[PDB]
Design a protein around this ligand. Structure first.
Ligand SMILES: Nc1ncnc2c1ncn2[C@@H]1O[C@H](CO)[C@@H](O)[C@H]1O
Lengths: 288, 338, 209, 57
């Protein structure tokens, strides 16, 4: 209702209205075509499904959380959980694409027999069930329900707590920073960096075994763009949560947190152009 | 005696052209303006026969209008069952490249020819067991671009070495040889009488051959490019030809000239295959721009468009009762239309 | 009922397709073809099969086709590489055989079906060429030429002309090897060129290229 | 001697196929029209048939 929140809602609506058509268009261009049913395109379909899920659901839920209608605690937890459920699936789909792109160059002769679309579907299903586990961990019982009930009893009322639904209060920072950020957000980032440096070393070796320099510079620029995009979109919000946990006396503005959140959702808009559009086949199918 | 004999040949050809224009009273469009038009026909896809991994080069239905043989580049000759999308047999092939396939009109033999210069005859009943190579017919020095069965006993085959041939199966020899083209003989069609068969060649000429005699009864030259595929009008008095110059032509046997030309200004792509329906009213022409055009075969108007494919269509078969039209493309999907 | 045999045939097609898809298909075009065939002959269309360093290669010789090339050529779309063999010693013999080979090379290069497919170029019979270059000059075929009679510059100029005939830039590569009579070197060059084509194909498929 | 023989065969066959007569075009075109109008009943593509008789539903 405030001006800063109004700016946040406007940017979130913009990111949703950009990210939904791109992902629908990626799923469309794969569906209509029969030549885009390889394993790597199954991975890009997995990311596009997670991505349209983000753009369709997480951004209305994010606006709902930030406005903050008063409601019961378990209702607010049920509303705030699919956010994590979908963002974790986005990160794991990114990781799966990077692992595939490593395997194509590491073992190029026998790649077709190793990575079949059945094994691709098994790996996508594994990534999704692990994203549901990581997302649904707060509902299993690790939240600030105990603290809210203690405060509710202290104020003297009885029953289920009716609280202004706000994401920092309902969910524990310890879960957000330790479990999520340490265990399931930072190793995908470091593992993608390691994998892409290894892929660049393999490509450099193969090419050396000015035109080569230009091609190498283009591949390096593409990899660095991918890694910078991922590490710019995800890391600010999690660093803010981490500094909020470690030093509670560290006072930060609200607009900083809002910028961090719409960068986190901005990744959902940026992913189709960076991933699907760079393939020549996908541009052919798009133009025709 | 070359120059005066060539002058004689040119004078005789001029006389033939003069006779053809003498018997040409008026155009067909003027007299067929009085026909109720067709309008617009779109067809619903009913099956999608997905069992091939490479490009499907040719198909041929059966007389049951139930079974169809498809032949693909990956070395598979599959007898699809169009009703319940089944696979009755799948035959592995010696040569991966197979540019034609045929199904015997009783449903007891399957013939396929490729670039290996060898027609192959596979029997289907085979009380000993599975399907076996029964007879191999090899007498050509060109690719066998099309072959058809007369009956269960003798097969007429076109080729790429400028010769059609008639083969007996029980012996393995050319019962007769049909010579007198200039270029590669891309396709032949049989009349339902099984006595006369056309054949379209790469010298822009379609020639009609008698089976018993062995001679060109009639010769039609009206195209600007090579003739890809050819198919009789169902009664046996006419045949349509498709060429790479984006024209379909309908040639009449009695009047001995071309009747009509199907050519549209938006089309600059070649015809890969033609066919007729049961009544002879629709001329189905596959193209290179990834879709099929259904032409009104009397009023020369495009009745419809069948655009269910992703790559160009290489074969187009029609059942003998006119139920369903199966178009087979290079993306390995036989789309059956109704 | 019939669906049991339908699924059995589906399984057999899938297994046979997995077996066939791992193999590499190569298209030969010619003059020095027999040297290559007999060299790597370890195990209409003349088809030969050989297995080198955990790869299976099927090489297809189309030389026994007395027909129009434009008809059968689109069958061979989708091969990994086109082994195109040129005799170096054909600059003198006959119009000119070297110009005929360059015309065929230009035709396959600018052919619309082979925009993607890479050409492995074999310039064969280096010994007869190095004798005949001291014997006879290259004024016959090329007016724009400087290093009149020397093997190195002569071979490099022939190679430069062939690779210059390529109109498509960076879409496909031309790999040139002067044919060695040493064992395993020709097959090794074929293996390296095919490996390079497979890696470039995978990088293009990623979009990373 | 081969070229003149090929041209001889060409001219003899060409005279052989020229010696036949030709029916006028309007009559044969009307015959094809009559065949189309005769078999216009049993053509399931031109004359549409609903899902009763259609074996492809
Ligand atoms: N401090 C926070 N305040 C609000 N939402 C947060 C916070 N930290 C993480 N999130 C949510 O978690 C998602 C990532 O798991 C973000 O898109 C955001 O919705």
């Amino acid at each position: 209702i405030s001006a800063f929140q109004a700016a946040y809602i406007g940017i979130e609506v913009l990111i949703a209205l950009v990210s939904v058509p791109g992902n629908v268009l990626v799923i469309w261009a794969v569906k209509v075509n029969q030549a885009l049913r390889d394993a790597t395109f199954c991975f890009i379909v997995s990311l596009a499904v997670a991505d349209v899920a983000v753009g369709a659901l997480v951004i209305p839920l994010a606006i709902l959380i930030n406005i903050g209608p008063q409601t019961y605690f378990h209702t607010c937890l049920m509303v705030a959980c699919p956010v994590l459920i979908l963002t974790q699936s986005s990160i794991l789909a990114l990781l799966a694409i990077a692992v595939d792109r490593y395997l194509r160059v590491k073992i190029p002769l026998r790649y077709k027999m190793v990575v079949t679309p059945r094994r691709a579907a098994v790996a996508i299903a594994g990534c999704w069930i692990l994203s549901f586990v990581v997302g649904l961990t707060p509902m299993f019982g690790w939240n600030n329900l105990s603290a809210v009930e203690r405060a509710w009893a202290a104020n003297g009322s009885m029953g289920e707590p009716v609280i202004k639904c706000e994401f920092e209060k309902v969910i524990s920072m310890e879960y957000m920073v330790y479990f999520n950020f340490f265990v399931w957000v930072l190793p995908p980032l470091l593992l993608m960096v390691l994998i892409y440096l290894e892929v660049f070393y393999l490509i450099r070796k193969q090419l050396n075994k000015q035109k080569y320099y230009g091609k190498e510079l283009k591949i390096a620029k593409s990899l660095a763009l991918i890694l910078f995009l991922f590490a710019l979109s995800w890391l600010p919000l999690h660093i803010l949560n981490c500094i909020t946990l470690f030093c509670p006396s560290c006072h930060k503005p609200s607009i900083l947190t809002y910028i961090a959140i719409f960068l986190t959702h901005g990744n959902s808009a940026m992913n189709p152009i960076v991933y699907a559009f760079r393939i020549q086949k996908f541009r052919v199918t798009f133009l025709k | 005696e070359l120059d005066q004999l060539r002058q004689e040949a040119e004078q005789l050809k001029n006389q033939i052209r003069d006779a053809r224009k003498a018997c040409a009273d008026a155009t067909l469009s003027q007299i067929t303006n009085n026909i109720d038009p067709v309008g617009r026909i779109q067809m619903r896809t009913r099956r999608t026969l997905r069992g091939h991994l490479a490009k499907i080069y040719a198909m041929h239905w059966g007389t049951d209008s139930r079974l169809l043989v498809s032949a693909s580049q990956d070395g598979k000759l599959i007898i699809w069952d169009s009703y319940t999308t089944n696979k009755v047999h799948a035959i592995p092939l010696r040569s991966s490249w197979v540019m034609t396939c045929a199904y015997a009109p009783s449903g007891n033999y399957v013939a396929c020819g490729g670039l290996d210069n060898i027609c192959s005859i596979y029997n289907l009943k085979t009380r000993e067991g599975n399907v076996r190579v029964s007879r191999e017919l090899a007498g050509h020095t060109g690719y066998l671009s099309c072959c058809r069965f007369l009956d269960d006993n003798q097969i007429v085959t076109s080729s790429g070495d400028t010769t059609c041939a008639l083969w007996d199966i029980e012996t393995g020899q050319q019962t007769t040889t049909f010579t007198g083209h200039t270029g590669d003989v891309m396709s032949l069609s049989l009349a339902p009488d099984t006595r006369l068969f056309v054949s379209g060649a790469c010298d822009a000429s379609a020639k009609l051959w008698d089976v018993r005699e062995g001679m060109c009864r009639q010769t039609f030259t009206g195209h600007e490019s090579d003739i890809n595929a050819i198919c009789f009008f169902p009664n046996g008095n006419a045949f349509a030809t498709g060429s790479d110059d984006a024209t379909c032509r309908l040639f009449d046997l009695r009047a001995d000239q071309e009747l009509m030309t199907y050519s549209h200004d938006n089309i600059i792509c070649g015809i890969t295959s033609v066919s007729f329906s049961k009544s002879g009213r629709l001329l189905l022409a596959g193209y290179d721009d990834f879709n099929c055009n259904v032409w009104d075969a009397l009023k020369a108007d495009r009745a419809g468009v069948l655009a269910g494919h992703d790559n160009r269509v290489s074969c187009l078969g029609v059942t003998d009762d006119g139920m369903a039209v199966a178009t087979g493309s290079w993306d390995s999907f036989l789309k059956i239309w109704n | 009922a019939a669906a049991e045999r339908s699924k059995m045939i589906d399984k057999n097609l899938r297994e046979d397709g997995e077996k066939a898809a791992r193999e590499v298909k190569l298209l030969l075009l010619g003059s020095g073809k027999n040297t290559i065939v007999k060299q790597m002959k370890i195990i209409g269309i003349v088809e030969t099969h050989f297995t080198f360093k955990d790869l299976h290669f099927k090489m297809f010789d189309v030389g026994a086709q007395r027909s129009e090339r434009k008809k059968w050529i689109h069958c061979f779309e989708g091969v990994t590489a086109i082994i195109f063999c040129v005799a170096l010693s054909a600059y003198d013999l006959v119009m000119n055989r070297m110009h005929a080979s360059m015309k065929l090379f230009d035709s396959i290069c600018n052919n619309k079906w082979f925009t993607d497919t890479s050409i492995i170029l074999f310039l064969n019979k280096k010994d007869l060429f190095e004798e005949k270059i001291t014997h006879s000059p290259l004024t016959i075929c090329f007016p724009e030429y400087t290093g009149a009679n020397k093997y190195d510059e002569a071979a490099s100029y022939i190679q430069s002309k062939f690779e210059d005939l390529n109109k498509r830039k960076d879409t496909k590569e031309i790999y040139t090897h002067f044919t060695c009579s040493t064992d395993t070197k020709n097959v090794q060059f074929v293996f390296d060129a095919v490996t390079d084509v497979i890696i470039k194909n995978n990088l293009k498929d990623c979009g990373l290229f | 001697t081969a070229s003149i023989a090929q041209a001889r065969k060409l001219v003899e066959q060409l005279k052989m196929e020229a010696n036949i007569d030709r029916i006028k075009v309007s009559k044969a075109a009307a015959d094809l029209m009559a065949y189309c109008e005769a078999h216009a009943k049993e053509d399931p593509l031109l004359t549409p048939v609903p899902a009763s008789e259609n074996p492809f539903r």
